[PDB]
Amino acid sequence: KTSFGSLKDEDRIFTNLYGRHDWRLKGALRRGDWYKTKEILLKGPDWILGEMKTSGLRGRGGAGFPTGLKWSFMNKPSDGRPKYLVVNADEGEPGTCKDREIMRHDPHKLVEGCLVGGRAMGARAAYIYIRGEFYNEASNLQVAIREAYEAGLIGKNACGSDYDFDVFVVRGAGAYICGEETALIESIEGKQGKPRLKPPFPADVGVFGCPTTVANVETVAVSPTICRRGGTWFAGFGRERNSGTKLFNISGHVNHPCTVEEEMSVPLKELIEKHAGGVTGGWDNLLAVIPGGSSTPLIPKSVCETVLMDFDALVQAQTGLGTAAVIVMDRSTDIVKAIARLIEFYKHESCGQCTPCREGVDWMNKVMARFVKGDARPAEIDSLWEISKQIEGHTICALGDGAAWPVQGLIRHFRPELEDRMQRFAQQH
Amino acid sequence: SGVNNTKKWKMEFDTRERWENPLMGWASTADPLSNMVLTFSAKEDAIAFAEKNGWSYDVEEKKVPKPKSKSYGANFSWNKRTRVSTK
Amino acid sequence: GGALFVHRDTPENNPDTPFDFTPENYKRIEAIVKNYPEGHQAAAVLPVLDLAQRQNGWLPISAMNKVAEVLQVPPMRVYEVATFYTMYNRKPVGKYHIQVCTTTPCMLRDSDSILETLQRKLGIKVGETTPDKLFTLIEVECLGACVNAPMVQINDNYYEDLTPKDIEEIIDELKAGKVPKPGPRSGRFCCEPAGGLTSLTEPPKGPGFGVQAGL
Ligand SMILES: Cc1cc2nc3c(=O)[nH]c(=O)nc-3n(C[C@H](O)[C@H](O)[C@H](O)COP(=O)(O)O)c2cc1C
Ligand code: SF4
Ligand code: FES
């Protein structure tokens, strides 16, 4: 009802998050994994979707979409085409390592979630597109998959259910745009990581031109624990429309950076000081914070105090949760420089098939380098705003929104810094 | 790809000789109607004008493109050849 | 620039350049192709190409052409992939390719110090190789190690939460024929806090715990 801060280990869902117990099948069974999955499967798929819905579980990929409805767009009769499930593990969003931690320290949960979601959707296999820089993680994942095939939990008779299911892993060759539902699919299919438009929707025609449902590592890894303990239990955590135990990644200008699970709608200040050791110099030295990943607008110290780290509160704070990768900056930062490096990152990682991002992101990178130097005039800030707004809702994917938003945040809270840089540059001439 | 000059009917005359001028090398004509072009809203209007003025005419019907089925999903198919390799 | 996206033939990189897969690589390729439906085998391009890269270290044009020939694909559909993805090396690289992350989650935590210390120890620039053809330094984006920052990636291994002294150690070791231990160079083993476990220091409950009845 209130004070959604603390969370006991009895309720933590990623138990081996710090590599303290064996990540193989022995620790998985000893910790509560691959238990009763047979009954989970012999239960109908509609029941699994009912659980996903009554849990309030919203995807963690960066957009707040409810799974149950997402995974229910796919609970249709088959038209003689194999249905699939594609797991998104290409966490290239700056500040995000939760999926790495999962992959490498508790992969049997991910595998069990693949199987559960597959029975929910009617799938035939699970394609786990994983980043290519994560070679050791993918190897651990394949080891786990081999253990599972040997134990009989996936394959011909998955746990003794009459349901046959495979799990494939796929490396990505290092691209951030391949993290989108659609460019992911194109990569798998062999083509460039160039997203496709919607419609069509992956559920109708997706990977290999077949029905498809893309989902984040955390979502699927949670699904079996929900179906096993209960969605209402998952929904007692957090606020009404946003609920669950969410992984957090606290990076930058913080003394004890870490990854953590907590109750959503938690106060950000607590989330920092209690788990981390607080910002290096003290809350007073906090210049600004990025609540989610690089694709989320900044918010300054002023509102960072009374802000709840969930979707809706961050929206009302003119920002968003995203992947919940709290990047912290103190007063010793050229914040303009950090945002300009973010824009350079988005410039490199753009695919280049739709004009707005392709051109305007490099445009904004040049303008931002100029602002760093201060060679610009303060009449160009509104030009940059207009450029951002021309990019925002006119793209095929969100990477344009992600490149436009941090600029909007910078200009919405740190315009005087830019104007002062311009004034100093004019004096220096 | 503009289709705004494919709306109004035109009237054009037969082409006649054009010979270089020896002095400069320009194109000369003894054809006053070499550049006569009239614009009509329909075919019967042009036919009437031609008949009236005493000219002989050969008409050419209007070419409208045929409506075409188009789908962005066809580019992504499981079994058909519409499957494209160039995204 | 350095990433030109064009290919002008040379003696080192021409179609006649001597590439070919090993009898083991061919069976790995057969398996890969088997991981996809029977009509869709042009989806193995990325794994087969990275495999060739592993065998040869880098990717010449003959490599892409042979990948195509094997998968029966147009070679341009492979040139596009190679140019698009950055993990694919189309110029020969050093024994130990060093990819330094310089995005803000790492930059904030003094990553340019590491970039410089590597510029000096090695005697190269931000995108060059060494005369010994052993080291190759480049700047790259977030590698999913934002909490254990700074960090660098050296030939499929990470080295995290490090400092000039630590990177100097790593380089002195790679120049002696050793392969160091991937992971944070500080006390912590992974993303766990440095002070101490603040989230899960209890023991885990184990099987059948929290299970709802009627399942
Ligand atoms: C440029 C870009 C990058 C993305 N990267 C990721 C990513 O790394 N991981 C992820 O889970 N979702 C990512 N997404 C979001 C995708 O839509 C994702 O496949 C989907 O939201 C996952 O479903 P879920 O959020 O319901 O779990 C990205 C989106 C865009 C536009
Ligand atoms: S916004 Fe950028 S990354 Fe997204 S589809 Fe357009 S060009 Fe590609
Ligand atoms: S910003 Fe360097 S690993 Fe993420």
From Swiss-Prot, chain A:
Binding site residues for FMN: 171-219
Reactions it catalyzes: a ubiquinone + NADH + 5 H(+)(in) = a ubiquinol + NAD(+) + 4 H(+)(out)
First-listed, main subcellular location of the protein, grouped into a coarse class: mitochondrion
EC number(s) on file: 7.1.1.2
Binding site residues for [4Fe-4S] cluster: C351, C354, C357, C397
Residues bearing the modification Omega-N-methylarginine: R229
Required cofactor names: FMN; [4Fe-4S] cluster
Modified positions (N6-succinyllysine) in chain numbering: K53
InterPro entries named in the record: ComplexI_51kDa_subunit, NADH-UbQ_OxRdtase_51kDa_CS, NADH-UbQ_OxRdtase_suF, Nuo51_FMN-bd, Nuo51_FMN-bd_sf, Nuop51_4Fe4S-bd, Nuop51_4Fe4S-bd_sf, SLBB_dom
GO process annotations (BP): aerobic respiration; mitochondrial electron transport, NADH to ubiquinone; proton motive force-driven mitochondrial ATP synthesis
Example of a GO cellular component annotation carried by this entry: mitochondrial inner membrane
Gene3D superfamilies cross-referenced by the UniProt entry: 3.10.20.600, NADH-ubiquinone oxidoreductase 51kDa subunit, NADH-ubiquinone oxidoreductase 51kDa subunit, iron-sulphur binding domain
Keyword field contains Metal-binding: yes
Annotated GO MF terms: 4 iron, 4 sulfur cluster binding; FMN binding; metal ion binding; NAD binding; NADH dehydrogenase (ubiquinone) activity
Enzyme class: translocase
Pfam family, one: NADH_4Fe-4S
Entry-linked PANTHER family: NADH DEHYDROGENASE [UBIQUINONE] FLAVOPROTEIN 1, MITOCHONDRIAL (PTHR11780:SF10), NADH-UBIQUINONE OXIDOREDUCTASE FLAVOPROTEIN 1 NDUFV1 (PTHR11780)
Name of the protein in question: NADH dehydrogenase [ubiquinone] flavoprotein 1, mitochondrial
Organism encoding this protein: Mus musculus (Mouse)
The encoding gene: Ndufv1
From Swiss-Prot, chain B:
Modified residues (Phosphoserine): S85
Localization terms from the record: Mitochondrion inner membrane
Phenotype on disruption: Reduces the levels of assembled mitochondrial membrane respiratory chain NADH dehydrogenase (Complex I) and the rate of Complex I-driven oxygen consumption. Growth is retarded although activity and behavior are not affected during the first 4 weeks. With aging, results in increasing lethargy, rapid deterioration of motor ability, weight loss followed by death. Mitochondrial ultrastructure is normal, although large subsarcolemmal clusters of mitochondria are present in the soleus.
Function as written in the Swiss-Prot or TrEMBL entry: Accessory subunit of the mitochondrial membrane respiratory chain NADH dehydrogenase (Complex I), that is believed not to be involved in catalysis. Complex I functions in the transfer of electrons from NADH to the respiratory chain. The immediate electron acceptor for the enzyme is believed to be ubiquinone.
Complexes and interactors: This is a component of the iron-sulfur (IP) fragment of the enzyme. Interacts with BCAP31 and TOMM40; the interaction mediates its translocation to the mitochondria; the interaction with BCAP31 is direct.
Family designation: Belongs to the complex I NDUFS4 subunit family.
Protein's UniProt name: NADH dehydrogenase [ubiquinone] iron-sulfur protein 4, mitochondrial
Lineage start: Eukaryota, Metazoa, Chordata, Craniata, Vertebrata
The gene coding this protein: Ndufs4
Residue span relative to the full protein: 89 to 175 of 175
Curated annotation (Swiss-Prot), chain C:
Subcellular location: Mitochondrion inner membrane
Primary location class: mitochondrion
Record PTM N6-acetyllysine, positions in chain: K27
GO molecular function, a single term: NADH dehydrogenase (ubiquinone) activity
PANTHER family per UniProt: NADH DEHYDROGENASE [UBIQUINONE] FLAVOPROTEIN 2, MITOCHONDRIAL, NADH DEHYDROGENASE UBIQUINONE FLAVOPROTEIN 2, MITOCHONDRIAL
Family the UniProt entry places it in: Belongs to the complex I 24 kDa subunit family.
Record note on quaternary structure: Core subunit of respiratory chain NADH dehydrogenase (Complex I) which is composed of 45 different subunits. This is a component of the flavoprotein-sulfur (FP) fragment of the enzyme.
Protein name as catalogued: NADH dehydrogenase [ubiquinone] flavoprotein 2, mitochondrial
Recorded name of the encoding gene: Ndufv2
